[PDB]
């Protein structure tokens, strides 16, 4: 599973696209992360999102 660092960097990479919809898996192979804005917090401007209370993450297992 990716570290906090790597999830935060992924959020950084996909800040323009980040949605209430689940993101693509952060990787093609192996274990990666998926992220989304909590549907409750969609009103907030992106640059102000709290990492703990406003974003959700889950592991995505892929081909090794």
């Amino acid at each position, epitope marked *: 599973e990716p570290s906090d660092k790597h999830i*935060k960097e992924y959020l950084n990479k996909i800040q323009n696209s980040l949605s209430t919809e689940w993101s693509p898996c952060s990787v093609t192979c192996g274990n990666g992360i998926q992220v989304r804005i909590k549907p409750g917090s969609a009103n907030k401007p992106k640059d102000e999102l709290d*990492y703990a209370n406003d974003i959700e993450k889950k592991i995505c297992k892929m081909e090794k």
Partner: antibody
Amino acid sequence: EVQLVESGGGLVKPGGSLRLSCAASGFNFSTHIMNWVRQAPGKGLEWVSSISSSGTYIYYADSMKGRFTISRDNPKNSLYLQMNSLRAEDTAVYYCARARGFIQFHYYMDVWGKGTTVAVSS
Amino acid sequence: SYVLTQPPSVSVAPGKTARITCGGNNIGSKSVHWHQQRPGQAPVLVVYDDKIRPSGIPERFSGSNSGNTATLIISRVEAGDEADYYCQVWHSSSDPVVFGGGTKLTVLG
């Protein structure tokens, strides 16, 4: 291009005051984190302050809270730094800077202005 | 109170690799960004998140980060790369922007 143009610097006495302005062009100003960073002569960069899009989240460097106040005017595309009770050690070039990311946990500065010069001397 | 340590000065001959180190406790667990300050001009972000070049930065700029030492590597260095380079990280909520002391890269042209 993205353009950040600082003004309002000058030479003042200790205990003096200045107001810096940064005029932003070339991007959605209303959506981006904005920042001030200074560099004293022959010293390195030192962050001053950051402000979120809506002005809700504002951080300061410990050495400057209370004396410096950051603010912005999104309709005017402008960032301000109010500097009061200036000290000799506040002599530096002050840069305006845009950042991408999330102010509360992961942001980085990606475009800087050329700076405006502040001098404080007895 | 988090400290980022850089050598004050690195000189290099044109065409060779310039390497600028940035030491910090567990810096490998942090994202490292690098800013270039050519003399007189606006600083430029050359690398962010350890190793990502923003659009417009030549491919000869690369970064590394592991353990306690991050490095900015400038291959095939040019006279125009002569600058003061600063590493930078986020330490905490109350310490969100920490700069190294800066390395002045001299290109011996």
